Ligand binder design. Sequence first.
Ligand SMILES: O=C1CC[C@@H](NC(=O)c2cscn2)CN1
Ligand SMILES: O=C1CC[C@@H](NC(=O)c2cscn2)CN1
Lengths: 39, 156
Amino acid sequence: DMYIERAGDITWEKDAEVTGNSPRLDVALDESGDFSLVE
Amino acid sequence: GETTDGVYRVMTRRLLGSTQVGVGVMQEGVFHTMWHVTKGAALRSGEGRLDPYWGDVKQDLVSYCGPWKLDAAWDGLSEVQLLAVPPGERAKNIQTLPGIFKTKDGDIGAVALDYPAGTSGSPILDKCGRVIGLYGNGVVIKNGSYVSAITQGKRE
Ligand SMILES: O=C1CC[C@@H](NC(=O)c2cscn2)CN1
Ligand SMILES: O=C1CC[C@@H](NC(=O)c2cscn2)CN1
């Protein structure tokens, strides 16, 4: 049996940690919902 | 059960201890998560039961108690925040400029942030606090890193 527990409000945080790059990738999506790289 | 708007952890007691299998969003009385988190199974919220209402394996999304309510979209230019809810750890916002998944059916925003699999379903927000999609379905790139699509449903 799966169950849910509240973890917080959904709000934008001013001055949150800023990280991560922005890659532009060629991808395919199959019928099972799995993404894959097209190369 | 608890029906207050917000981000929730999706837990299971079937495995060792209490394990977090994912995350979801409660908005307008509907619970929204990724299909791979629950596999369409019923959910418990205290003494209450949440039954699936809509789901789609290809989109990897599922809603409970009602139709999908989230319809905000990434504007294609601005930074966003992943409100990551990792297993056993506090909710924390991480700001990032999304990249792009280019497909034969159109372009989708993508976030290059790495978290344990049990973080799937954490919401991605715009500057107005609107949920523009869920984190947790994507790809592993050439350096072992993880890049998730910004997955959004359709409000009927
Ligand atoms: O066309 C296809 C490709 C593979 C399979 N999809 C699933 O993974 C699946 C089906 S029911 C739950 N998952 C069935 N359909
Ligand atoms: O929410 C998320 C983040 C981690 C991701 N894990 C992987 O499937 C995976 C396999 S190899 C690297 N990551 C799943 N979804």
